[PDB]
Amino acid sequence: VLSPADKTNVKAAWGKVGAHAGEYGAEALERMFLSFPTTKTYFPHFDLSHGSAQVKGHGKKVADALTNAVAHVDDMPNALSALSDLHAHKLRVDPVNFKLLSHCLLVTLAAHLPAEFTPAVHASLDKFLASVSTVLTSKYR
Amino acid sequence: VLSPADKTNVKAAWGKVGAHAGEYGAEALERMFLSFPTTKTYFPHFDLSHGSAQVKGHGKKVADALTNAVAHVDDMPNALSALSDLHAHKLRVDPVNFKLLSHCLLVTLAAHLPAEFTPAVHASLDKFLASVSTVLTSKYR
Amino acid sequence: VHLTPEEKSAVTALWGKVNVDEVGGEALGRLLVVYPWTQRFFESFGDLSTPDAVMGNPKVKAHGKKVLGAFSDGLAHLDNLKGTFATLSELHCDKLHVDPENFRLLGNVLVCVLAHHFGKEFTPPVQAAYQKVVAGVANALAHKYH
Amino acid sequence: VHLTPEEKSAVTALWGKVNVDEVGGEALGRLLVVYPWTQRFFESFGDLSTPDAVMGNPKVKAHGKKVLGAFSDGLAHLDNLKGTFATLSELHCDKLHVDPENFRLLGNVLVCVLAHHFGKEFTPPVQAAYQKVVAGVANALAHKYH
Ligand code: HEM
Ligand code: HEM
Ligand code: HEM
Ligand code: HEM
Ligand SMILES: C[C@H](Oc1cc2cc(F)ccc2nc1N)c1cc2c(cnn2CC(=O)O)cc1-n1cccn1
Ligand SMILES: C[C@H](Oc1cc2cc(F)ccc2nc1N)c1cc2c(cnn2CC(=O)O)cc1-n1cccn1
């Protein structure tokens, strides 16, 4: 459950990503695949080599979905309904993998946006990614 | 995130719980204290002996809060706001303990309401208790 | 696993009354219904699309009996759970990549099934003894991660 | 924990550049801010009521340095993490009853702090090597939960 300060912090830190959505998402995915190799099992059909156009294209989609989540932060079960159908009903992703990708997203933000990554903002982003993860891993439709 | 079927299953099950809500709450606490003794560290001020009036009284309060959660299942952040302040800000309960109490509640319901405790209802109740646990362990004011 | 003599006697006596044809299948079925991502590991079982399809699936019933056999093996070797579950830990951890939190979930669903079958006879002290057993089995199954 | 010679060199080189007065305190401070229930274990530290109060607290800074020293001890004994962390496992598990998921959380907050301090030099392969280390430390600290 996000506080009003959390939503303010998330809108501010996420908005700073801007035109670099693809770069951040793709690096978070690369960090996840290298750090937690079992996560590769969900992407047998991807070219996972470094700098793969497929991972870049997917990173942009992941980042754009989080931007959509921020734009509808109080209505995520409706805004993300198609993503929940995909991750919960079709792919059946184990929720541990969402903790892994969320951690890799925080690591990417810490590395590339140091001034924005304050302890309060880190806390708010972690809560936001946990809320998004609950929506994407729950079958509510 | 609860589905419409989840909310229906929980309302139907907790209605069958009925007058025994308080008794089930006290048994779930007793099961938690015996099965996971580290949970006793939150209650140094309680008489935790079997059939303690204190545990019975507390079980009724816990069960009444869950009844309130069922009655306001789509507005739990507001309905449980005082309880989230108590558990998340004052007591600082580690969220693992909510998984422990939730499990003990499910065990109590399975033992006492076998006909109602179908796999679909068990699934809905587990999701409902996870959602209540998220509200009570989050600082959102 | 450190069980008191009275807990060891209670656990053994309840276990002897378990319906071996039903309990394992109900525990595995409930895991698949309650934690639906676990179905990803059982694509060879076919239809698992509804609770009724899961519970009536003969592969769930047969596999559940094998799982129940492994918990039985645990109860017979409470002093050497790591050794007992060594090859099974290698299968789940290195070959299947099952996240170990799922082992805790199955242990707890089994406890719910035991409560469902035994009712009020699945007392808080009997449960406490079973919680020590299922925690032990879950930890032994996770031992081959590192 | 197994690190390749390349990973061992990369991990050691970055670790040598860690600001010992800041990194441990930032990791512990961030744990207290991000996972606020962890504050229950640190009542003796006084004011932890706001992120600024946590981050400026000298007890958090001093205790964080001891935690950083324990991770450093882990890096010096990658072949014997269980042995290295035996007394700290007794303290955390047997005396304090810290749930072991919190050890994984602190390991991961430390990795966030290393990324925050090192920026682009905290590359995905360097992170992967550090993830093996922190998982090893967390598992070794959790050893006494049996
Ligand atoms: C914040 C968490 C996540 C978000 C926002 C997210 C978002 C997305 C989006 C937007 C798509 C593309 C949907 C489309 O084009 O119709 C997608 C696909 C997918 N996601 Fe996720 N995802 C997340 C976490 C995960 C995790 C943790 C895994 C597994 C480790 C995962 C595995 C997949 C896979 C396998 C696909 C299909 C890829 C393809 O075939 O193109 N996702 N995800
Ligand atoms: C579904 C989960 C839970 C619910 C609905 C719940 C509900 C309640 C309620 C209604 C109160 C009394 C508030 C008042 O009278 O003003 C309370 C108090 C308390 N709860 Fe919880 N609780 C839950 C879980 C937990 C857990 C997991 C723990 C710790 C293991 C815990 C520890 C406490 C403590 C220490 C108090 C204060 C008791 C006292 O001094 O009277 N609660 N809880
Ligand atoms: C925690 C308690 C568990 C026990 C005691 C257990 C026990 C077993 C046993 C005895 C086997 C058969 C070994 C063989 O025939 O080679 C087995 C197979 C397997 N287990 Fe588990 N298991 C547990 C948890 C899990 C969980 C949580 C999952 C997945 C979420 C899982 C997935 C599997 C799969 C996929 C197989 C192979 C099935 C096949 O042959 O198609 N197990 N398990
Ligand atoms: C996972 C990595 C961790 C490491 C390497 C670690 C390391 C340490 C060290 C080296 C000590 C000092 C021991 C001494 O002076 O005898 C310590 C004390 C302690 N740790 Fe940890 N710790 C970890 C995680 C945690 C977590 C997650 C918590 C609580 C959430 C925690 C709570 C404490 C407390 C309360 C003490 C005693 C502090 C005091 O003396 O007041 N630790 N830890
Ligand atoms: C709209 C949402 O609504 C819910 C979020 C929930 C999150 C669960 F984790 C569990 C149940 C939830 N139920 C909601 N109604 C919500 C309502 C909130 C707060 C804080 N107070 N309130 C009430 C109020 O402002 O009037 C935070 C959120 N929130 C949005 C995203 C994540 N959390
Ligand atoms: C009111 C609540 O609102 C939220 C619950 C949330 C739960 C998070 F875990 C995270 C974010 C949430 N945001 C909400 N707005 C909610 C809205 C839902 C569904 C299913 N669809 N919808 C949308 C719709 O009916 O129009 C389920 C819930 N729900 C209530 C209790 C638990 N979940």
Side-chain angles (χ1 to χ4, degrees), chain B residues 67-111:
Chain B
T67 304
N68 199 41
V70 174
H72 301 282
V73 69
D74 289 335
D75 193 33
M76 293 193 303
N78 291 310
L80 306 178
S81 61
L83 291 177
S84 161
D85 194 58
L86 176 57
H87 293 83
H89 185 254
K90 199 179 166 199
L91 305 164
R92 288 169 224 194
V93 182
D94 188 309
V96 70
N97 302 105
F98 280 79
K99 300 188 174 179
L100 306 180
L101 182 55
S102 291
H103 169 64
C104 292
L105 281 158
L106 295 178
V107 167
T108 305
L109 293 169

Tab-separated table of all heavy atoms in Angstrom, chain B residues 67-111:
chain	number	residue	atom	x	y	z
B	67	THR	N	-13.418	-9.523	10.165
B	67	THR	CA	-14.814	-9.333	9.744
B	67	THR	C	-14.964	-7.959	9.132
B	67	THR	O	-15.624	-7.813	8.099
B	67	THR	CB	-15.769	-9.522	10.933
B	67	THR	OG1	-15.516	-10.822	11.464
B	67	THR	CG2	-17.213	-9.457	10.506
B	68	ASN	N	-14.327	-6.954	9.738
B	68	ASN	CA	-14.376	-5.584	9.228
B	68	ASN	C	-13.705	-5.522	7.861
B	68	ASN	O	-14.220	-4.862	6.975
B	68	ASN	CB	-13.702	-4.630	10.196
B	68	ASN	CG	-14.096	-3.222	9.979
B	68	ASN	OD1	-15.266	-2.888	9.725
B	68	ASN	ND2	-13.117	-2.363	10.112
B	69	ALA	N	-12.570	-6.223	7.697
B	69	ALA	CA	-11.847	-6.337	6.418
B	69	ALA	C	-12.756	-6.951	5.343
B	69	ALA	O	-12.824	-6.416	4.253
B	69	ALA	CB	-10.603	-7.197	6.578
B	70	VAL	N	-13.489	-8.047	5.663
B	70	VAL	CA	-14.426	-8.676	4.716
B	70	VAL	C	-15.518	-7.680	4.315
B	70	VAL	O	-15.829	-7.588	3.125
B	70	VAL	CB	-15.059	-9.977	5.278
B	70	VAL	CG1	-16.148	-10.536	4.341
B	70	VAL	CG2	-14.001	-11.039	5.553
B	71	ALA	N	-16.102	-6.960	5.298
B	71	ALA	CA	-17.189	-6.005	5.056
B	71	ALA	C	-16.742	-4.811	4.199
B	71	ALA	O	-17.581	-4.146	3.589
B	71	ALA	CB	-17.735	-5.503	6.382
B	72	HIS	N	-15.431	-4.521	4.201
B	72	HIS	CA	-14.852	-3.393	3.452
B	72	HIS	C	-13.694	-3.889	2.591
B	72	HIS	O	-12.680	-3.203	2.463
B	72	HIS	CB	-14.371	-2.302	4.433
B	72	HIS	CG	-15.479	-1.777	5.300
B	72	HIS	ND1	-16.404	-0.854	4.824
B	72	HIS	CD2	-15.852	-2.153	6.547
B	72	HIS	CE1	-17.295	-0.696	5.794
B	72	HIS	NE2	-16.969	-1.401	6.875
B	73	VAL	N	-13.869	-5.061	1.947
B	73	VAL	CA	-12.804	-5.722	1.198
B	73	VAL	C	-12.214	-4.824	0.078
B	73	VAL	O	-11.012	-4.922	-0.166
B	73	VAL	CB	-13.230	-7.126	0.716
B	73	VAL	CG1	-14.311	-7.084	-0.368
B	73	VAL	CG2	-12.033	-7.956	0.288
B	74	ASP	N	-13.008	-3.896	-0.500
B	74	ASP	CA	-12.468	-2.997	-1.539
B	74	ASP	C	-11.939	-1.680	-0.983
B	74	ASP	O	-11.506	-0.815	-1.763
B	74	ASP	CB	-13.536	-2.700	-2.602
B	74	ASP	CG	-13.823	-3.896	-3.475
B	74	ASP	OD1	-12.927	-4.765	-3.606
B	74	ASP	OD2	-14.923	-3.954	-4.050
B	75	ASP	N	-11.989	-1.499	0.340
B	75	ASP	CA	-11.502	-0.255	0.945
B	75	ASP	C	-10.692	-0.582	2.208
B	75	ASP	O	-10.800	0.116	3.214
B	75	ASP	CB	-12.694	0.663	1.269
B	75	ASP	CG	-12.376	2.107	1.612
B	75	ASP	OD1	-11.393	2.648	1.061
B	75	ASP	OD2	-13.137	2.707	2.390
B	76	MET	N	-9.873	-1.643	2.146
B	76	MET	CA	-9.100	-2.059	3.310
B	76	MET	C	-8.084	-1.016	3.775
B	76	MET	O	-7.971	-0.863	4.980
B	76	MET	CB	-8.470	-3.415	3.105
B	76	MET	CG	-9.557	-4.501	3.035
B	76	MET	SD	-8.881	-6.164	3.179
B	76	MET	CE	-7.822	-6.140	1.917
B	77	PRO	N	-7.379	-0.266	2.909
B	77	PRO	CA	-6.485	0.771	3.431
B	77	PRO	C	-7.213	1.734	4.378
B	77	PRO	O	-6.651	2.105	5.410
B	77	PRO	CB	-5.979	1.448	2.152
B	77	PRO	CG	-5.964	0.303	1.149
B	77	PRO	CD	-7.298	-0.333	1.431
B	78	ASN	N	-8.445	2.148	4.054
B	78	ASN	CA	-9.144	3.044	4.979
B	78	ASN	C	-9.726	2.303	6.175
B	78	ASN	O	-9.602	2.782	7.309
B	78	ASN	CB	-10.225	3.873	4.270
B	78	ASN	CG	-9.618	4.876	3.332
B	78	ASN	OD1	-8.712	5.631	3.698
B	78	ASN	ND2	-10.100	4.909	2.107
B	79	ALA	N	-10.397	1.164	5.934
B	79	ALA	CA	-11.039	0.429	7.028
B	79	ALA	C	-10.042	-0.051	8.084
B	79	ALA	O	-10.393	-0.122	9.260
B	79	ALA	CB	-11.836	-0.744	6.484
B	80	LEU	N	-8.828	-0.397	7.666
B	80	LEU	CA	-7.787	-0.911	8.570
B	80	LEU	C	-6.687	0.114	8.907
B	80	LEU	O	-5.652	-0.265	9.440
B	80	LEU	CB	-7.160	-2.181	7.950
B	80	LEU	CG	-8.147	-3.293	7.565
B	80	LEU	CD1	-7.416	-4.471	6.928
B	80	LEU	CD2	-9.021	-3.741	8.728
B	81	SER	N	-6.894	1.402	8.604
B	81	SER	CA	-5.851	2.419	8.821
B	81	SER	C	-5.305	2.464	10.244
B	81	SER	O	-4.080	2.557	10.389
B	81	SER	CB	-6.283	3.803	8.367
B	81	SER	OG	-7.416	4.238	9.082
B	82	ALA	N	-6.177	2.387	11.286
B	82	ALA	CA	-5.687	2.406	12.671
B	82	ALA	C	-4.862	1.148	12.964
B	82	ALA	O	-3.868	1.216	13.689
B	82	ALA	CB	-6.847	2.507	13.651
B	83	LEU	N	-5.277	0.014	12.410
B	83	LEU	CA	-4.538	-1.228	12.614
B	83	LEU	C	-3.205	-1.279	11.883
B	83	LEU	O	-2.261	-1.889	12.388
B	83	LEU	CB	-5.391	-2.447	12.278
B	83	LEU	CG	-6.541	-2.696	13.233
B	83	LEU	CD1	-7.343	-3.886	12.744
B	83	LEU	CD2	-6.030	-2.953	14.688
B	84	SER	N	-3.105	-0.629	10.698
B	84	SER	CA	-1.837	-0.516	9.991
B	84	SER	C	-0.904	0.396	10.805
B	84	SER	O	0.261	0.050	11.014
B	84	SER	CB	-2.073	0.015	8.579
B	84	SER	OG	-0.853	0.531	8.059
B	85	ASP	N	-1.423	1.505	11.356
B	85	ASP	CA	-0.587	2.362	12.216
B	85	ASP	C	-0.039	1.548	13.392
B	85	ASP	O	1.153	1.624	13.682
B	85	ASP	CB	-1.383	3.565	12.759
B	85	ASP	CG	-0.458	4.619	13.351
B	85	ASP	OD1	0.430	5.114	12.614
B	85	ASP	OD2	-0.552	4.871	14.561
B	86	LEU	N	-0.895	0.731	14.036
B	86	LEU	CA	-0.468	-0.094	15.153
B	86	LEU	C	0.609	-1.124	14.734
B	86	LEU	O	1.630	-1.249	15.416
B	86	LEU	CB	-1.677	-0.837	15.759
B	86	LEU	CG	-1.404	-1.830	16.895
B	86	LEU	CD1	-0.693	-1.177	18.035
B	86	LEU	CD2	-2.684	-2.486	17.377
B	87	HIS	N	0.351	-1.916	13.682
B	87	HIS	CA	1.274	-3.010	13.350
B	87	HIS	C	2.533	-2.573	12.603
B	87	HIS	O	3.609	-3.144	12.813
B	87	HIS	CB	0.557	-4.124	12.585
B	87	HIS	CG	-0.459	-4.837	13.422
B	87	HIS	ND1	-1.733	-4.322	13.589
B	87	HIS	CD2	-0.367	-6.014	14.083
B	87	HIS	CE1	-2.383	-5.219	14.329
B	87	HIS	NE2	-1.602	-6.272	14.619
B	88	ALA	N	2.390	-1.615	11.702
B	88	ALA	CA	3.506	-1.158	10.849
B	88	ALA	C	4.340	-0.071	11.474
B	88	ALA	O	5.556	-0.070	11.281
B	88	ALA	CB	2.954	-0.668	9.522
B	89	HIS	N	3.697	0.894	12.163
B	89	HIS	CA	4.441	1.996	12.766
B	89	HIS	C	4.780	1.788	14.231
B	89	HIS	O	5.900	2.093	14.627
B	89	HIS	CB	3.729	3.338	12.571
B	89	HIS	CG	4.539	4.488	13.081
B	89	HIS	ND1	4.210	5.137	14.254
B	89	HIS	CD2	5.693	5.011	12.600
B	89	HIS	CE1	5.141	6.061	14.427
B	89	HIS	NE2	6.059	6.018	13.460
B	90	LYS	N	3.818	1.303	15.061
B	90	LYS	CA	4.120	1.157	16.482
B	90	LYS	C	4.836	-0.137	16.815
B	90	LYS	O	5.909	-0.107	17.419
B	90	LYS	CB	2.841	1.293	17.315
B	90	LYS	CG	3.106	1.614	18.759
B	90	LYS	CD	1.793	1.753	19.502
B	90	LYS	CE	1.993	1.743	20.999
B	90	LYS	NZ	0.729	1.414	21.713
B	91	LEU	N	4.232	-1.274	16.462
B	91	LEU	CA	4.795	-2.578	16.822
B	91	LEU	C	5.908	-3.035	15.912
B	91	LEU	O	6.706	-3.881	16.333
B	91	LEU	CB	3.719	-3.665	16.875
B	91	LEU	CG	2.519	-3.404	17.777
B	91	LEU	CD1	1.396	-4.375	17.418
B	91	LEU	CD2	2.908	-3.547	19.263
B	92	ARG	N	5.924	-2.558	14.649
B	92	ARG	CA	6.961	-2.926	13.694
B	92	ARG	C	7.025	-4.433	13.508
B	92	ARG	O	8.111	-5.022	13.547
B	92	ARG	CB	8.336	-2.311	14.105
B	92	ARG	CG	8.345	-0.806	13.866
B	92	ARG	CD	9.550	-0.122	14.492
B	92	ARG	NE	9.160	1.110	15.181
B	92	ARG	CZ	9.988	2.062	15.594
B	92	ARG	NH1	11.288	1.984	15.333
B	92	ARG	NH2	9.517	3.121	16.242
B	93	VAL	N	5.844	-5.076	13.339
B	93	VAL	CA	5.786	-6.532	13.177
B	93	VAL	C	6.459	-6.954	11.857
B	93	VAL	O	6.081	-6.476	10.782
B	93	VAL	CB	4.339	-7.078	13.234
B	93	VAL	CG1	4.324	-8.606	13.100
B	93	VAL	CG2	3.618	-6.641	14.506
B	94	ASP	N	7.424	-7.907	11.935
B	94	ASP	CA	8.031	-8.437	10.704
B	94	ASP	C	6.928	-9.144	9.885
B	94	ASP	O	6.177	-9.954	10.434
B	94	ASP	CB	9.135	-9.445	11.065
B	94	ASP	CG	9.963	-9.917	9.873
B	94	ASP	OD1	9.373	-10.341	8.879
B	94	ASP	OD2	11.219	-9.942	9.985
B	95	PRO	N	6.836	-8.863	8.580
B	95	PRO	CA	5.764	-9.464	7.753
B	95	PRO	C	5.737	-10.990	7.753
B	95	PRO	O	4.691	-11.582	7.473
B	95	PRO	CB	6.033	-8.930	6.335
B	95	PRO	CG	6.913	-7.753	6.514
B	95	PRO	CD	7.623	-7.871	7.826
B	96	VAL	N	6.867	-11.650	8.066
B	96	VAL	CA	6.837	-13.122	8.126
B	96	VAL	C	5.794	-13.579	9.140
B	96	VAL	O	5.103	-14.563	8.897
B	96	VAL	CB	8.224	-13.756	8.405
B	96	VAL	CG1	8.705	-13.493	9.831
B	96	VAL	CG2	8.226	-15.260	8.088
B	97	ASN	N	5.634	-12.829	10.258
B	97	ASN	CA	4.671	-13.243	11.275
B	97	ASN	C	3.243	-13.232	10.764
B	97	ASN	O	2.414	-14.002	11.260
B	97	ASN	CB	4.828	-12.356	12.505
B	97	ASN	CG	6.212	-12.411	13.077
B	97	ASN	OD1	7.043	-11.478	12.924
B	97	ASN	ND2	6.577	-13.581	13.513
B	98	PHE	N	2.927	-12.364	9.786
B	98	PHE	CA	1.572	-12.352	9.227
B	98	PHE	C	1.349	-13.608	8.370
B	98	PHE	O	0.242	-14.122	8.366
B	98	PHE	CB	1.349	-11.093	8.397
B	98	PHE	CG	1.030	-9.925	9.276
B	98	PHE	CD1	2.041	-9.247	9.957
B	98	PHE	CD2	-0.282	-9.499	9.439
B	98	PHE	CE1	1.734	-8.162	10.774
B	98	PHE	CE2	-0.578	-8.412	10.244
B	98	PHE	CZ	0.431	-7.754	10.913
B	99	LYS	N	2.419	-14.129	7.696
B	99	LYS	CA	2.292	-15.383	6.950
B	99	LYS	C	2.005	-16.527	7.923
B	99	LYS	O	1.194	-17.401	7.635
B	99	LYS	CB	3.547	-15.681	6.112
B	99	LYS	CG	3.823	-14.574	5.084
B	99	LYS	CD	4.939	-15.008	4.158
B	99	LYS	CE	5.137	-13.999	3.051
B	99	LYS	NZ	6.238	-14.402	2.140
B	100	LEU	N	2.675	-16.495	9.095
B	100	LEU	CA	2.482	-17.484	10.149
B	100	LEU	C	1.098	-17.453	10.705
B	100	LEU	O	0.484	-18.507	10.774
B	100	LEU	CB	3.534	-17.311	11.256
B	100	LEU	CG	4.989	-17.333	10.762
B	100	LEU	CD1	5.947	-17.156	11.925
B	100	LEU	CD2	5.313	-18.647	9.968
B	101	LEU	N	0.576	-16.270	11.082
B	101	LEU	CA	-0.787	-16.221	11.615
B	101	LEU	C	-1.832	-16.607	10.550
B	101	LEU	O	-2.798	-17.316	10.855
B	101	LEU	CB	-1.113	-14.847	12.221
B	101	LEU	CG	-2.498	-14.722	12.855
B	101	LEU	CD1	-2.757	-15.798	13.925
B	101	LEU	CD2	-2.719	-13.337	13.417
B	102	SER	N	-1.610	-16.163	9.312
B	102	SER	CA	-2.506	-16.455	8.184
B	102	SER	C	-2.604	-17.955	7.975
B	102	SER	O	-3.705	-18.489	7.855
B	102	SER	CB	-2.012	-15.778	6.907
B	102	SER	OG	-2.166	-14.376	7.061
B	103	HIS	N	-1.454	-18.641	7.988
B	103	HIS	CA	-1.399	-20.100	7.865
B	103	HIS	C	-2.183	-20.745	9.027
B	103	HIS	O	-2.978	-21.646	8.785
B	103	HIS	CB	0.072	-20.564	7.889
B	103	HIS	CG	0.223	-22.043	8.021
B	103	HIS	ND1	-0.229	-22.909	7.031
B	103	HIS	CD2	0.782	-22.766	9.020
B	103	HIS	CE1	0.050	-24.126	7.474
B	103	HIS	NE2	0.659	-24.089	8.662
B	104	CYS	N	-1.985	-20.259	10.276
B	104	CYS	CA	-2.679	-20.830	11.434
B	104	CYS	C	-4.182	-20.624	11.373
B	104	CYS	O	-4.934	-21.524	11.808
B	104	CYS	CB	-2.069	-20.327	12.734
B	104	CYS	SG	-0.393	-20.960	13.010
B	105	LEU	N	-4.628	-19.479	10.787
B	105	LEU	CA	-6.048	-19.206	10.554
B	105	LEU	C	-6.588	-20.232	9.542
B	105	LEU	O	-7.655	-20.813	9.765
B	105	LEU	CB	-6.273	-17.774	10.027
B	105	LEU	CG	-6.233	-16.627	11.057
B	105	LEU	CD1	-5.939	-15.286	10.373
B	105	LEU	CD2	-7.561	-16.526	11.838
B	106	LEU	N	-5.839	-20.470	8.441
B	106	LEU	CA	-6.297	-21.451	7.436
B	106	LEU	C	-6.398	-22.839	8.036
B	106	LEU	O	-7.359	-23.566	7.769
B	106	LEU	CB	-5.364	-21.488	6.216
B	106	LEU	CG	-5.325	-20.198	5.395
B	106	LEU	CD1	-4.334	-20.336	4.259
B	106	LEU	CD2	-6.692	-19.831	4.869
B	107	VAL	N	-5.413	-23.205	8.876
B	107	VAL	CA	-5.439	-24.517	9.545
B	107	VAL	C	-6.691	-24.641	10.436
B	107	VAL	O	-7.346	-25.680	10.442
B	107	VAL	CB	-4.138	-24.744	10.355
B	107	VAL	CG1	-4.265	-25.938	11.315
B	107	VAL	CG2	-2.908	-24.880	9.438
B	108	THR	N	-7.005	-23.578	11.193
B	108	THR	CA	-8.182	-23.566	12.061
B	108	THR	C	-9.468	-23.727	11.249
B	108	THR	O	-10.378	-24.474	11.640
B	108	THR	CB	-8.189	-22.272	12.877
B	108	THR	OG1	-6.938	-22.154	13.580
B	108	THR	CG2	-9.372	-22.227	13.853
B	109	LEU	N	-9.553	-23.022	10.121
B	109	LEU	CA	-10.752	-23.087	9.277
B	109	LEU	C	-10.884	-24.464	8.641
B	109	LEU	O	-11.972	-25.030	8.627
B	109	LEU	CB	-10.730	-21.973	8.228
B	109	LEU	CG	-10.862	-20.541	8.782
B	109	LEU	CD1	-10.566	-19.517	7.717
B	109	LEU	CD2	-12.234	-20.289	9.456
B	110	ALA	N	-9.753	-25.054	8.220
B	110	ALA	CA	-9.771	-26.402	7.623
B	110	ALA	C	-10.297	-27.436	8.627
B	110	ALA	O	-11.098	-28.325	8.273
B	110	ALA	CB	-8.366	-26.783	7.209
B	111	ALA	N	-9.801	-27.329	9.877
B	111	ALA	CA	-10.183	-28.250	10.963
B	111	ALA	C	-11.650	-28.131	11.338
B	111	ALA	O	-12.296	-29.162	11.569
B	111	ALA	CB	-9.297	-28.007	12.186
